[PDB]
Structure formats: C-alpha cells, structure tokens
Amino acid sequence: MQEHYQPAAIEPAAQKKWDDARISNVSEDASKPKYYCLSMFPYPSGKLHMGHVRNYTIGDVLSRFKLLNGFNVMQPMGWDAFGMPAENAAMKNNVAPAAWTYDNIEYMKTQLKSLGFAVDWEREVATCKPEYYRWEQWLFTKLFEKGIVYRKNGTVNWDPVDQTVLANEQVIDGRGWRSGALIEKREIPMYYFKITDYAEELLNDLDKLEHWPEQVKTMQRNWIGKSRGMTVRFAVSDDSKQGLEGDYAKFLQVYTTRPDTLMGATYVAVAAEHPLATAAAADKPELQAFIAECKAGSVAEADMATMEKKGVPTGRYVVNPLNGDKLEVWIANYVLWGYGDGAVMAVPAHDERDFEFAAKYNLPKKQVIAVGDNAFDANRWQEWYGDKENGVLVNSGDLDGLDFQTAFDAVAAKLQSQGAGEPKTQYRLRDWGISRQRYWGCPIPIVHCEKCGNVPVPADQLPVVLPENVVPDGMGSPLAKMPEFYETSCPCCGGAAKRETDTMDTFIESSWYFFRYMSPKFSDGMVSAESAKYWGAVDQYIGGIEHAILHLLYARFFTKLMRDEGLVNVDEPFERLLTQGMVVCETYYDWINPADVELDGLPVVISGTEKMSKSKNNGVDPQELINAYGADTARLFMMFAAPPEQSLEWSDSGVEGAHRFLRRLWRTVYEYLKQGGAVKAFAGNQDGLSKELKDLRHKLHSTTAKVSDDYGRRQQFNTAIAAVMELLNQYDKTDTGSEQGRAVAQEVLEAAVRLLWPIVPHICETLWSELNGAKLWEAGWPTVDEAALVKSEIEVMVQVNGKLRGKITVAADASKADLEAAALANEGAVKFMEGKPAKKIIVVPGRLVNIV
C-alpha cells in the first residue's frame, strides 16, 4: 500500500473495477428486491457544473447505500435533449441543433463517468432520437382518437417584425423582446391534452403520497385549484335589456365560492367581452374606451394581482334572487372572459379585492357575516372579514345564524327551488397546450388532408422523423419551409396532404422517460410489460423545487394515461421525492467565470452570491475540481457542507477540508497496516475485552446505527459523515496495539470504509481491498451488534435512614424510579423498615438509595 493518497491513480482503477464487474448494469432479476433511484436528467446544454453534481451525488449516495443492503438497484441517466437551448446555439454559432446536442452529450457523459456514479449506462436514452420520441408520437395518436388530445384555436403572441410566435416570457411591456414591435394576439389551431378531465384524480391521488414533502403536494393542489361553489343567476331588470340577445337577455350568471354571502352582494362585475358590457357600450364611448384598454392589457396572473383594479358603471341592472335587490352591473378589468361565466358578484364587506374596489368608487358594503364579537367598521378591512370557518350569518333573514357549510347548503336549496342556481365544481387547471412553433422538438404526428381533415399518422408509419440537417435562424419555423418534410400523402385516402409542422412541448419527453429507462430498447411499445411489472414505480426521485409543479404534474398525468392504456399498473410514478438545495457561488464581471479570476491580469468586479448556473457564468466545472483534488473530494465536500435540502455555498476552504479528511482516512488505514498487517475483524462475545476496547466497539456500533438511519430514514448525509468522523476520533484515542486491540481496529476500519463507500466510493473501495479480500459489495452494509451497546451494570448501596442495609445490582440505564423500586424490595431494607412507610427516598444515581 502506497503511503500517500493519490486520487488521480486510484479513481480510474476503481471505476474500471466497477465497470468490469458490471455492478451497476442491472436486469429484471426476480431473485433480488428492486430499487429504482432516479435523479432528474439534465438538458445537454454544454457542461454540467457543481450544482448538477450535488443532485447526482445525492442520487448516487442513495443508490450505493441500497446496493450495499442487497438491492437490485437501477440508477439510470439520460439526456433531456429537445428544446430552446440548442435552437439558440444554432442562431449563435450557426450550427445544427442535433450536432450541438450530441457534442454536449459526449462531453457531459465523460463529466459524469469521472465522478464515478453507479449508473446503468446501458439504459442511457437521448430524447431527441427517433427510437425515443416515436413512442410519445404513438401515445399522441392513441389519445387523439379518444379525444384526450384535441385540436382547437388558441391565442398566441405574434411578433410582426421577427415573423414568429413568442413565449409570454419574451413579451416585455406589450412588445417583442428582441424587436420592440407591438405584439399581436392571434388565434391559431393548436393541440391540447384534456388534462382537466383528470383533475379530480390528479388532486385526490396526492393523498396516496405519504412520503412526499407536504409543500410539494400543497403546490400541486393549489395549481389544480379545485373549488366547490355555486352557480347563481341574476335576472336582467326590465329596463336593462336593450341590445341583449338570447340567455344574456334573461339573466346574468356568475360563479361564487361564497354563496353564504349572496345577501351581502351590492353590485356585480362583468368582463369587457361580456355581452352586457358590449350592449351597454353601444351609445357610451367611455365604456368603449374602457373595453379597449382592457383587451390591450396582460391577462397573465403575474400582472393581474400587481395591477390596479378599475371599473366603469354600465347603467344596467340585475336582481339578486335571494333578497330582490337591484344591483348595478359594472365592467371591471379584473374579470376574465373565457374563465367560466365572465361575471362575478361583489361582496365588499367580506372579500378584500371587492372592499378595495368599493372603497375606490364608494360602492355599498353590506355585512352578512359576524365572527364572534368582533368589531366591524365599514371603513377599514380586517383579516377576519373573510373568515370562512368561524363566522355566522347576520342580516340574512331565513339564513340568520348558520355557519358557512350550513348556509351554503341552504342557499343551494333555496336557489334550486327557484331555478336560480345550483352547486358547481370548478378548477383553475386549464388544458395542456402541446403545440410549439419551433424546429428542435418532437414532430406532431398529424397529416392535414383537404378531404379527410386532421388525420393521425398510423402506428406502422411512426416515427414522423425530424430532419436533423437543419440550421434554424429565428426567421420562423424551418419545418414550414421544407417541402421535403411537410409534403406527404394522406394516410386515409392517399391524396396529397401536408404534415403538421409544429413540434411538441418538451415537457412531454420528461413526462414518461422514467418508464422508458425500464426497457430503453423495446421496439414494440413505450415500455415492455415484463419490465414495467418488475420495476414498478420510481422508489426515489431527486430534483430541484423548480419542477415541483408542471413537470411533476405532467409526469403523474402521463402515468395515469399510460396506466389507462394498459401499459403500466401504477397510479403514481414517484414514491419518494427529495428536493435538493441549490449550490450557490459568487459571481463576477460581461459575466466572468470564477475559475478564470483571482483575488488579462486586470481586476474584475466581485458581485453577489447566487445559484450556480450558466446565466451568470458561475458554474464550477467538476473536471477542474477533479483534476485538482479528485472525484471523492468533490463528492465529500458536497455531501458534508450542508444538509441536502439546504443551500450550499461554494467554498475553496470547504474543498480543502474535504481533501484533508480523505488524507486522514488514507493515513489511518496505512498506519494501521504498517503496524502489522490485516487480521480477522473482531466478532462475537466481547466479555474479556478491556474497558477501552468495549468503549470503542460501543462507539462503532452506535455509529453504525446512526449512519444507517441517516442514509435510510433521515436522508441527511452531512450528519452521517460527521458521525464516522467521531468514530475515528475515538479510534485515534484508543490503544489498539494488543492482539485483541488489532482485531477491534480491523472491525472499526472495515466498518468505516463501508459506511463511507456511498459518499466516497473510490478511496473506500481501495482502502477496503487493502484491509479485506472479499468484494466490498458482497460483504454488504455493516451490521449492528446489539451486545456491543449494552453498558455495564453498577452496584448501589441501600440505606434505611442512612444506615447501610443491603446492596442492589442495577442497570447503567436505570431511572431514579427503578432504583427506588429495587431499593424497596431489597431483603435487608425491607427488614429494617419494620412495616413503616417511607417519608422520602433519596436517590443518588450510581451511588446510593436512602429510604426515610
């Protein structure tokens, strides 16, 4: 054994040993319990950095722990390869997105190999390959014929100068980002998933997820946004019917989640496009100007809560079906058209938005809810004005005195009796828009035929292959300029037709890739039946909180869709979820990378500390750290600097500390083997061992219990490492030179290197092979010796009134109440008490009990 730790030598040799043994290339082995551990797969956008590395190190730690405990572990890796990264590089470096992507994949794959993650590379997928995306095309066509995928007109941002569709994130202040031209709202046919048909299932199945962070479940619930409410119709007053045609001539319909306050309604508000607004804006140019200002604002919810809420009265009136009140209709800019009825009632006394609107225009406030004895000034708003759980109805006639749910059901009964309303469930969830007017994405498997319509491509003809020899330039979708792509024949009638040239939202690839890893070469379906049955669901998913809503909701949706298609038999894709904290790093600037600065030879300006990312160019390349210190130093530093969920500050001094600890561990094993070579590790009955060696074994086995619980239950790796460090401090303070000393030392060292192998497997593999000839992964996770934890019993003096009357043998863990009990039953005490009770019993732990 070499004296000094050389990671540049031992880390390649350890990786070759694992690769050659194929320990991470797994099959559907029924004779082994499965464990599927998944980290969110990266975009192949150029280089991984230490942030990605923390995520994948967490996943590898968990995989290697399960591997040591006998599991058949699948830890797969792949490339989320479609999307806007490569298209933007295509406009920059004037290169094809495919070539840019495959080159980043090659570079990034070697980044991962050199960190030594226990990954089944035979299961690698790249989502931009036909062998992959043909199956999301297949599922698309199967859902399209069921109506689960459908075609309908939707709104898009059309940039008239750049001649392309823009994402909302690229429309700044009404105009295009890279052009400043005023953006047009256009209606174009697009494709949607009818995810609203699964809202209740997607909401209710969250309850099954007993091992998810409650915050992630809460965010999904809020996104789905189910509400139980009440449709309510207000009769159009007789003087207010001009210009109105149809049912709009008879009533104004709204949805409320507070029908228990319908008696508190003092006006009603309609959207600018509501037929009452347009009818009242007939002879009214100011209503016309308000309606126009509305249509030119941003309906995005981000602007909505941060916008000043305005309105104009319409001179039209409707009637409250409960108390007969005539209420004016207002046009208001916060009421959205297309979101249900496009009209709301307003109860200013019990809804904050309505209170501010009514305080602006001096509209009435009518109290219908009292929360206890609380004071109500119609002038100030109070948090309890909206209290739904502790209020009771006032000024409501028949309904005086009921709580929220009772009044809700009573209003339901009264309104249905009058045909004026009915219960109704709504969701804020909208359908999922698939269409993207972009080149670098999965083609939509639809052919447009003038006689047949929108025809799905037959399964035999899938995939619809995306041509890779394309260099986009942002001048609109290149697929729409390639007749050799879009010109085709109709699959139904054989006539001339045209392919759809839009491509799919790239969230579609990440919505089922975790099933594809189960059989990434299956040619007859998305996932084979045999492998889906074996691997079941993902046991452990690790990714950042930025994907806690859309990505996770989409994946759960696809799982149900695939289950409904008969392809898998789980309801939920991910059993456990770990949301790792962000690695953050100081930035510098024209943004300069930390590895190229020092504190041209000229200085830079040192700016703030933020999430590591290419946006501010503050990603530390792991290859730089590995060349300097080794993969194990990088892994150890990540796992030790912070609990995995807390943010982690990049730190030069943290890297050095990790490296010193690995030199320490190397030194410990070398100095041990220097003093006499490997022996059989201590095992069995420890009677006869010296106190110091018993104490070292107690430390050892309690360290084994605490590490197993930190990896397995707590998933807190920093404290597991800190625990192994304490064992070595105890070790260092123990004279292990005797024959029994060497055997305990061997036991300690054999346990430490296995306990740390999930964190730093290169050094631990190497040290283990110097200690013990067996394969580390067949020796398995260290076991806890319960006897090693039993401390020694102590003898206690039993005094009756201060005079010694006996002795008791008591356990080292014994409480004051056990001592009191054992003392009271001692034959010598019981005799010298003469049936008299105790006035007091003084317990001195470890020394004496004195009965008064």
Q: Which listed option, Zn ion, ligand LSS, none, makes contact with residue 452 (CB within 5 to 8 Å by class)?
A: Zn ion
Q: Please state, in angstroms and rounded to a whole number, the distance separating the CA atoms of residues 623 and 634.
A: 10
Structure tokens at 736: 């292990």
Q: Which listed option, ligand LSS, Zn ion, none, makes contact with residue 393 (CB within 5 to 8 Å by class)?
A: none
Q: Residue 268 in contact with residue 345, Cβ under 8 Å?
A: yes
Q: What minimum distance in Å lies between the beta carbon of 477 and Zn ion?
A: 24
Which residue, 394 or 492, has its beta carbon nearer to Zn ion? 492
Which residue, 259 or 619, has its beta carbon nearer to ligand LSS? 619
CB atoms within 10 A of CB 416: 13
Which residue, 547 or 742, has its beta carbon nearer to ligand LSS? 547
Q: Which listed option, Zn ion, ligand LSS, none, makes contact with residue 55 (CB within 5 to 8 Å by class)?
A: ligand LSS
Which residue, 434 or 843, has its beta carbon nearer to ligand LSS? 434
Which residue, 139 or 638, has its beta carbon nearer to ligand LSS? 638
Q: What minimum distance in Å lies between the beta carbon of 611 and ligand LSS?
A: 5
Q: Please state, in angstroms and rounded to a whole number, the distance separating the CA atoms of residues 326 and 236.
A: 9
Residues that bind ligand LSS (CB under 6 A): 40-43, 51-52, 54-55, 80, 510, 543-544, 547, 551, 580, 582-583, 611-613
Secondary structure (H, E, C), 683-744:
CCCCCCCCHHHHHHHHHHHHHHHHHHHHHHHHCCHHHHHHHHHHHHHHHHCCCCCCHHHHHH
Q: Please state, in angstroms and rounded to a whole number, the distance separating the CA atoms of residues 343 and 334.
A: 10
Tokens 């869709």 — which residue? Answer: 561
Which residue, 44 or 630, has its beta carbon nearer to ligand LSS? 44
Label the pairing between strands 574-578 and 538-542: parallel
Q: Please state, in angstroms and rounded to a whole number, the distance separating the CA atoms of residues 603 and 597.
A: 8
Which residue, 265 or 582, has its beta carbon nearer to ligand LSS? 582
Q: What minimum distance in Å lies between the beta carbon of 338 and ligand LSS?
A: 29
E strand spans, 92-147:
125-126
Q: What minimum distance in Å lies between the beta carbon of 446 and Zn ion?
A: 12
Q: Which listed option, Zn ion, ligand LSS, none, makes contact with residue 40 (CB within 5 to 8 Å by class)?
A: ligand LSS
Which residue, 126 or 449, has its beta carbon nearer to Zn ion? 449
Label the pairing between strands 72-74 and 34-39: parallel
Q: Please state, in angstroms and rounded to a whole number, the distance separating the CA atoms of residues 86 and 83.
A: 7
Q: What minimum distance in Å lies between the beta carbon of 588 and ligand LSS?
A: 17
Q: Residue 300 in contact with residue 168, Cβ under 8 Å?
A: yes
Q: What minimum distance in Å lies between the beta carbon of 266 and Zn ion?
A: 58
Q: To 5 degrees, how large is the angle CA 426–CA 431–CA 434?
A: 175
Q: Which listed option, ligand LSS, Zn ion, none, makes contact with residue 54 (CB within 5 to 8 Å by class)?
A: ligand LSS
Structure tokens at 37: 């551990």
Q: Which listed option, ligand LSS, Zn ion, none, makes contact with residue 612 (CB within 5 to 8 Å by class)?
A: ligand LSS
Q: Which listed option, Zn ion, ligand LSS, none, makes contact with residue 547 (CB within 5 to 8 Å by class)?
A: ligand LSS
- How far CA 336 is from CA of 171, 186, 308, 342, 359, in Å, comes to 20, 17, 15, 6, 22
Q: Which listed option, ligand LSS, Zn ion, none, makes contact with residue 754 (CB within 5 to 8 Å by class)?
A: none
Structure tokens at 605: 């300006």
The 3-state DSSP class for residue 230 equals strand
Tokens 């909180």 — which residue? Answer: 545
Q: What minimum distance in Å lies between the beta carbon of 170 and ligand LSS?
A: 19
Q: What minimum distance in Å lies between the beta carbon of 284 and ligand LSS?
A: 50
Q: Which listed option, Zn ion, ligand LSS, none, makes contact with residue 490 (CB within 5 to 8 Å by class)?
A: Zn ion
Q: What minimum distance in Å lies between the beta carbon of 640 and ligand LSS?
A: 16
Q: What minimum distance in Å lies between the beta carbon of 457 and Zn ion?
A: 12
Q: What minimum distance in Å lies between the beta carbon of 169 and ligand LSS?
A: 16
Q: What minimum distance in Å lies between the beta carbon of 405 and ligand LSS?
A: 40
CB atoms within 10 A of CB 156: 20
Which residue, 45 or 141, has its beta carbon nearer to ligand LSS? 45
Q: Please state, in angstroms and rounded to a whole number, the distance separating the CA atoms of residues 707 and 567.
A: 39
Q: Which residues contact 109 (CB under 8 A, 6 or more apart)?
A: 121, 124
Q: Which of 178, 700, 191, 223 lies closest to 473, judged by CA?
A: 178
Label the pairing between strands 583-588 and 78-79: unpaired
Residues that bind Zn ion (CB under 5 A): 449, 451-452, 490, 492-493
At 308, give phi and psi (nearest 5°): -75, 125
Q: Which listed option, ligand LSS, Zn ion, none, makes contact with residue 544 (CB within 5 to 8 Å by class)?
A: ligand LSS
Q: Which listed option, ligand LSS, Zn ion, none, makes contact with residue 41 (CB within 5 to 8 Å by class)?
A: ligand LSS
Q: Please state, in angstroms and rounded to a whole number, the distance separating the CA atoms of residues 605 and 471.
A: 37
Which residue, 453 or 737, has its beta carbon nearer to Zn ion? 453
Which residue, 449 or 504, has its beta carbon nearer to Zn ion? 449
Which residue, 424 or 551, has its beta carbon nearer to ligand LSS? 551
> Which amino acid, 494?
G
Q: What minimum distance in Å lies between the beta carbon of 657 and ligand LSS?
A: 20
Q: Which listed option, Zn ion, ligand LSS, none, makes contact with residue 72 (CB within 5 to 8 Å by class)?
A: none
Q: Which listed option, Zn ion, ligand LSS, none, makes contact with residue 15 (CB within 5 to 8 Å by class)?
A: none
At 800, give phi and psi (nearest 5°): -100, 110
Q: Residue 650 in contact with residue 638, Cβ under 8 Å?
A: no
DSSP-assigned letters across all residues of 632-661: HHHHHHHHHHS-TTS-EE--HHHHHHHHHH
Q: Which listed option, Zn ion, ligand LSS, none, makes contact with residue 539 (CB within 5 to 8 Å by class)?
A: none
Is 599 exposed, middle or buried (CB count within 10 Å of its CB: 0-12, 13-18, 19+)?
exposed
Q: What minimum distance in Å lies between the beta carbon of 506 and ligand LSS?
A: 9
Which residue, 511 or 668, has its beta carbon nearer to ligand LSS? 511
Q: What minimum distance in Å lies between the beta carbon of 145 and Zn ion?
A: 16
Q: Which listed option, Zn ion, ligand LSS, none, makes contact with residue 262 (CB within 5 to 8 Å by class)?
A: none
Q: Please state, in angstroms and rounded to a whole number, the distance separating the CA atoms of residues 618 and 593.
A: 5
Q: Residue 230 in contact with residue 422, Cβ under 8 Å?
A: yes
Structure tokens at 237: 């007053």
Q: Residue 708 in contact with residue 754, Cβ under 8 Å?
A: no
Q: Please state, in angstroms and rounded to a whole number, the distance separating the CA atoms of residues 55 and 37.
A: 12
Percent helix, percent strand, percent coil in the chain, to nearest 5: 40, 20, 40
Which residue, 578 or 796, has its beta carbon nearer to ligand LSS? 578
Which residue, 176 or 644, has its beta carbon nearer to ligand LSS? 644
